[PDB]
Amino acid sequence: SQRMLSFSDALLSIIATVMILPVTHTEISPEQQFDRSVQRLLATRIAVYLMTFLIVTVAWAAHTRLFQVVGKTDDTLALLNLACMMTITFLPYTFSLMVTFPDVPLGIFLFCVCVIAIGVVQALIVGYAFHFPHLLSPQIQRSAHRALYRRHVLGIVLQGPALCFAAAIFSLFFVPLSYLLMVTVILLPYVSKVDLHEPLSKERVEAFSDGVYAIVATLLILDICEDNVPDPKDVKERFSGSLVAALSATGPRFLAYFGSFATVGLLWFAHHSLFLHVRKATRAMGLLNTLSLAFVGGLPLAYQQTSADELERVRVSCTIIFLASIFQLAMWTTALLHQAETLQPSVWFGGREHVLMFAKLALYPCASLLAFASTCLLSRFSVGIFHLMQIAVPCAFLLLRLLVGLA
Amino acid sequence: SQRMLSFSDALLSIIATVMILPVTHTEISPEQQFDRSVQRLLATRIAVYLMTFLIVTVAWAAHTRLFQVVGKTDDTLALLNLACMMTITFLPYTFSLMVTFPDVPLGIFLFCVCVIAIGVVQALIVGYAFHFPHLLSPQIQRSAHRALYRRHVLGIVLQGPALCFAAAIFSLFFVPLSYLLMVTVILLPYVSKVDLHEPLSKERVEAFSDGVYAIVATLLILDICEDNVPDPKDVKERFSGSLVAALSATGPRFLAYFGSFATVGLLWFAHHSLFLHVRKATRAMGLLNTLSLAFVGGLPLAYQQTSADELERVRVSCTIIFLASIFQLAMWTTALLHQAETLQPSVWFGGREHVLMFAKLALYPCASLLAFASTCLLSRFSVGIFHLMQIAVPCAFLLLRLLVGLA
């Protein structure tokens, strides 16, 4: 069923985003005398977040590819894919167990137990589909007489788990540098030396993108609602017998959320407008989408420091913006492959909304590059001015594009 | 556009769920000598979570009703509804500001500022639609000549904000018992003394349900990933130079997540199977759905205590299960209204999957009622046995239903 995939992508997007939580609240204030240690901690949190997001995205891609061939789904497959969701959910904790405890073989053992678990869940799904082949994709067996496709399906869904099991066996009593056998789970699908590897549909990848955009836009208000509300005892504290004082004190956090939700929401708007006119995505499009989502998940942190010299924090925020928006612009740049089967005819080269899409997606990279140029001038606190300009232009952007095209 | 509503419902579901975060981690351990204060704190967190979920659901219903009449959407309306998302997002914090600081008029002022903000955003959306009436619903003005419908739209979208403004003005220098003028925002839509009030579509309400189910299933693994991983210094701590000891110590949390995700996932499965065969929902269906989602959002807490005499905690968990599942069973009970326009013909009274749906939705209420009966016996620790039985039966539930129907 198509609709179970909606819950699938929502839950897997939340799982992909789980790692940004320790990243957002990371004691950014340098009042403690452990600045080098704090920077090392930020480095490891960003690294683990990126790696976990990539791993969960790979798992989600595998799940949706499996559910393309078995699109028709009964209740039993619903329970089986719920078990698959259990396993994908437990993957990030095992990855974190690796990262925090590298030398201990137990982390490798648990992560590969998780990989074997997801693999055997997929294998059970495929076996149940095979035993009653009425719910497959319409052309796999309802139209094709080749049942040998089952062997390829089993291979693609079990190559990873077997390699992870072998890597765990190696790590038990061999050199722990055998991390590459685990990298094989992404290496082998990446290479195509030997219809399973068809690119992901626009609907599912866009649903994942929408879910991750929603969670990264809302996580900062999650932080606000956690403990940023003034306490009943706090009004007696600080000798401020009023609520205006506490609200003003917590105000910069609210300005941070203002900027964060604004930037993330308009990035989602640009991503959406890009994905309105795509009809058949490519693997490069999926890779650029996952990279862009990984780098846009970090905007909460970037704005969280830039709200609190500070030119370096503004630089970090603008660099995150630049990365997260160039990885969106690479999607639209990936039209030289073929405009016929990737983009709608109305948005083709020399199209009706042609320059509209160019500019509507290139303003954010343009804004970040102008910030990079502005770093030279001392009054480089234009990111707030950039915030206002970049949120005000799309309201009148149609008029600006019409004026540019008139000449 | 239909698809922008997907991001709408995802973000608004996350906003509706934001309040369960302080509820989940609420120092349940009674080792502190403030047990009465702890119980009072739990009471206020549950109350604020329920009220906030109801308020955000009302806001989401208003938003989706507005976007039914203006379903065709351009970029400008995308930015406007993003601003509406800003306002709906900020609503829960203002509600919490009320709850923590009741007597202070500032909380009322800020919440009504938020209400006026969402109201004026809706008003701007309606005005932009009116000035260029090419993107309305196909029958509002593309087929109906009555432009007076604009007055009713403005009334329905501005009656709430005006009443909240009046209530704030009252609270400024009158008795603060004027909370009822704010209850009017839900009272007036509830009453129908005087096509805007058409019941919500199955797609949107089911998308909201799927989003909230995903977040409530995943929030416990969020808690696990936050700080439940053993620390690099923790292995030196407790004189346990190994990882097995720390993993076993944090094990009951993982069993809690096992049970939580299992119960929430199968409740989502029951809800989904219920919503496969509905084609036109009613207002009673929407009310029962929002009530059920509110009461299923609390399962994380319930299992969080029941993992950690304890018969009372098991009782709380089973009571939450009972409420969250009777409020689903009331959906299916609401078929006596009309099976023709609510349920698919294959699932009508005396249908093919008739007893299938009855039992498939009634097992969880049956399990909770059996737990209530089992509380009498001393060995009432059958909820784990109930967990295993209730997750094992749906795998073979089709066979059980076939055997029952054979006789």
Swiss-Prot record, chains A, B:
Effect ascribed to mutating residue 21 to A: Does not affect selectivity
Site residues (Hydrophobic filter residue 2-2), renumbered to this chain: 219
Cytoplasmic side stretches: 69-74, 129-152, 277-282, 335-354
GO MF terms held by the record: arachidonate binding; potassium channel activity; potassium ion leak channel activity; proton channel activity
Effect of residue 219 to A: Does not affect selectivity
Reactions that this protein is recorded to catalyse: H(+)(in) = H(+)(out); K(+)(in) = K(+)(out)
Outcome following mutation: residue 289 to L: Reduced potassium channel activity without affecting proton channel activity
Impact reported for residue 304 to L: Increased potassium and proton channel activity
Site (Hydrophobic filter residue 2-1): 18
Organism: Homo sapiens (Human)
Site (Hydrophobic filter residue 1-2) residue list: 215
Effect ascribed to mutating residue 331 to W: Reduced potassium channel activity
Region of interest called Short helix H1-2, as start-end residue ranges on this chain: 232-240
Motif (RxxxFSD motif 2): 204-210
Alphabetical keyword list: Endosome, Hydrogen ion transport, Ion channel, Ion transport, Lysosome, Membrane, Neurodegeneration, Parkinson disease, Parkinsonism, Phosphoprotein, Potassium, Potassium channel, Potassium transport, Transmembrane, Transmembrane helix, Transport
Record keyword Transmembrane helix present: yes
One of the protein's GO biological processes: proton transmembrane transport
Spans annotated as Short helix H2-1: 33-39
Outcome of swapping residue 13 to T: Decreased selectivity for potassium ion
Topological domains annotated Lumenal: 25-45, 97-106, 174-178, 227-253, 305-313, 379-380
Protein name per UniProt: Endosomal/lysosomal proton channel TMEM175
